[PDB]
Design an enzyme around this catalytic site. Structure first.
Site, short mmCIF file in Angstrom:
data_model
loop_
_atom_site.label_atom_id
_atom_site.label_comp_id
_atom_site.label_asym_id
_atom_site.label_seq_id
_atom_site.Cartn_x
_atom_site.Cartn_y
_atom_site.Cartn_z
CE1 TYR A 189 -4.68 0.20 0.63
CE2 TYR A 189 -4.01 -2.09 0.49
CZ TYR A 189 -4.99 -1.12 0.44
OH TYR A 189 -6.29 -1.49 0.18
CG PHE B 65 -6.46 -6.49 8.22
CD1 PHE B 65 -5.50 -5.73 7.58
CD2 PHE B 65 -7.50 -7.03 7.47
CE1 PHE B 65 -5.56 -5.51 6.21
CE2 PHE B 65 -7.57 -6.81 6.11
CZ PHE B 65 -6.60 -6.05 5.48
CG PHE C 235 -12.04 2.19 9.39
CD1 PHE C 235 -12.40 1.35 8.35
CD2 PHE C 235 -11.43 1.63 10.51
CE1 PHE C 235 -12.16 -0.01 8.42
CE2 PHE C 235 -11.19 0.28 10.59
CZ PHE C 235 -11.56 -0.55 9.54
CE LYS D 228 -8.71 7.31 -1.34
NZ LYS D 228 -8.06 8.42 -0.59
CD1 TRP E 176 -1.22 -9.03 0.98
CD2 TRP E 176 -3.36 -8.37 1.02
NE1 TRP E 176 -1.79 -9.52 2.13
CE2 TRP E 176 -3.10 -9.13 2.18
CE3 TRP E 176 -4.64 -7.84 0.83
CZ2 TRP E 176 -4.08 -9.37 3.14
CZ3 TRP E 176 -5.61 -8.09 1.78
CH2 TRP E 176 -5.32 -8.85 2.92
C1 1SV Z 1 -8.05 -2.83 8.29
C2 1SV Z 1 -9.09 -2.72 7.48
C3 1SV Z 1 -10.09 -3.83 7.41
C4 1SV Z 1 -9.28 -1.47 6.66
C5 1SV Z 1 -7.95 -0.85 6.24
C6 1SV Z 1 -7.17 -1.64 5.19
C7 1SV Z 1 -7.96 -2.11 3.97
C8 1SV Z 1 -8.09 -0.99 2.95
C9 1SV Z 1 -7.20 -3.28 3.37
C10 1SV Z 1 -8.05 -4.06 2.38
C11 1SV Z 1 -9.29 -4.59 3.08
N1 1SV Z 1 -9.97 -3.55 3.82
C12 1SV Z 1 -9.36 -2.51 4.38
C13 1SV Z 1 -10.14 -1.77 5.44
#
Ligand code: 1SV
Ligand code: 1SV
Ligand code: MG
Ligand code: MG
Ligand code: MG
Ligand code: MG
Ligand code: MG
Ligand code: MG
Lengths: 304, 304
Positions: free
Chosen positions: A54, A74, A140, A168, A295
């Site tokens: 990223y 995550f 978020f 975002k 990824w």
């Molecule tokens: C941690 C997350 C779920 C958020 C930030 C990272 C990002 C864009 C990676 C891809 C999957 N979704 C998200 C949302």
């Protein structure tokens, strides 16, 4: 699933190997996994690898901060799937004053002190830029348990919502922090259409590759937390095709968004609005789009 | 505009040229064209050619009926673009009892006696099969001036409305009439899913190729009757892309509907539910889809 042609060249941060071992190792010590299978699955996901894809031009001494943040988010993202909207909201809201540093963490609860120690370390390195990630992260977090997930959404309404649920703004503020890239409010305002376009790409590319994971989740997790909320299901429903057919169509749209990204960037330069900072910024957004795709295509989180 | 690969091969009725001259000749004699330029444009459209591409296996002595019906509907379709929804509705509703033969036509008004004589001649050739086209046509006529045209629609909502505005039902009954293909209510119930899928293909293929014509109409004709109602606009609005970008994505979706058609037909056959009449019918639908695309690709109606 064969991806349609893209002109974007994905780039990975050169320190991905050492940072991944550093950050994975940290969470393996501190985070509370249910079993050895979950510990392996965690490493298999490659959460620092996404981050390095990223933000491949993040400063060498700042990339680890970004890896730690996306990793914990995550992990929380998965936990929320077994909670109701109310429980999930309570879980997240507790972490917000802690993220600000206004409230001390319960040292017996891993998620509380991991979050606290992280944000403290980030403000210690760069206080001004770390603070600018706070509100985007909270935006978020609060989107994750939004009641709109339990309401029918068209493609347009979904993408508008998903800009927050995909984080975002946090990704934008995190990228700038990691690169030490400062932009004036005037510069930030100028690239808003570019931001919105990029958000759709990130969201739909994720929706495409994470569908199987989230379909299974919707059948096994919480009735609210595990709810199927994705452009794949929406398009399949609206166009009356299979999920796999919806993926192929959505992938083509993603390429159109890539074309639009280039068009908007060219127009920004054709007008007087191009700055060195903005050039680095919009280039960084491209890396987010291509890195997210690379990824997604390779991570075991989506294939298993 | 590059069409993605398709396995559907178009077929044209053998008597297309002789029937074209017959049907074009009839309307050139009776229909109130404003000037020579309009008469030339009318011939340039090839309304009998598209009909012969739609129903290439129509019986030799019935294909002209189909050409006449579609030709007069096409002519009215353009007329409605200069009317308000109200005027358009009053125009169509007047023709409905006339089509049934319940009300005699004003012989000084071409559209009335053309429509009256058509349906009378069709009922003379095949009373039962002609009657089964009536209500599907009326459903289509009333959809043309439906105020849902001027209200927000998602892709799914559009397609379900479009099925009426594209006259999917009338085309199916017209095809059956033209081929003398009689199906039981139960047989027709078996292919309902196949009909619905085919409708989306016909609609979007037309939307793609007729966009430029309709964009111009929306800017020049009546703000209501000529309103821009098409999947090209809808998807472009939903995904924030250009019309050209939307076209390319929709074309991929069209190919998915072709795959679905083959899947549904294969399933019907495997379950031992595909009767010889149903086999002819579903093949007839494939001719409609492929024939619609060939004509759309080449007709001067859309290119100039
Ligand atoms: C941690 C997350 C779920 C958020 C930030 C990272 C990002 C864009 C990676 C891809 C999957 N979704 C998200 C949302
Ligand atoms: C006459 C019409 C305008 C209707 C019937 C024919 C068909 C499907 C051909 C393609 C363009 N539009 C239509 C709608
Ligand atoms: Mg998730
Ligand atoms: Mg999520
Ligand atoms: Mg996902
Ligand atoms: Mg029209
Ligand atoms: Mg029309
Ligand atoms: Mg059209």
């Amino acid at each position: 699933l064969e991806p349609p042609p893209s002109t974007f060249q994905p780039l990975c941060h050169p320190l991905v190997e050492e940072v991944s071992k550093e950050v994975d190792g940290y969470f393996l010590q501190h985070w509370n996994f249910p079993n050895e299978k979950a510990r392996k699955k965690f490493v298999a996901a490659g959460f620092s690898r996404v981050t390095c894809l990223y933000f491949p031009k993040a400063l060498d001494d700042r990339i680890h901060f970004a890896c730690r943040l996306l990793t914990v988010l995550f992990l929380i993202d998965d936990l929320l799937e077994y909670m109701s909207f109310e429980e999930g909201s309570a879980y997240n809201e507790k972490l917000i004053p802690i993220s600000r540093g206004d409230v001390l963490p319960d040292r017996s609860i891993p998620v509380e002190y991991i979050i606290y120690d992280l944000w403290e370390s980030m403000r210690a390195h760069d206080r001004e830029m770390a603070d600018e990630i706070l509100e985007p992260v909270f935006l978020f977090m609060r989107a994750q348990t939004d009641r709109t997930r339990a309401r029918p959404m068209g493609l347009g309404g979904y993408l508008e919502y998903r800009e927050r649920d995909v984080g975002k703004e946090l990704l934008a503020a995190l990228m700038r922090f990691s690169m030490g890239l400062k932009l004036s409010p005037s510069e930030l305002q100028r690239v808003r259409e570019i931001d919105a376009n990029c958000s759709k790409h990130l969201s739909v590319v994720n929706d495409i590759y994470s569908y199987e994971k989230e379909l299974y989740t919707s059948k096994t997790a919480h009735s609210e937390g595990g709810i199927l909320c994705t452009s794949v299901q929406i398009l399949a429903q609206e166009a009356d095709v299979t999920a796999e057919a919806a993926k192929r169509v959505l992938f083509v749209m993603c390429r159109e968004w890539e074309l639009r990204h280039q068009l908007l960037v060219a127009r920004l330069s054709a007008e007087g609005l191009e700055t060195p900072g903005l050039a680095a910024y919009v280039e960084g957004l491209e890396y987010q789009m291509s890195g997210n795709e690379l990824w997604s295509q390779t991570t075991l989180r989506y294939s298993v």
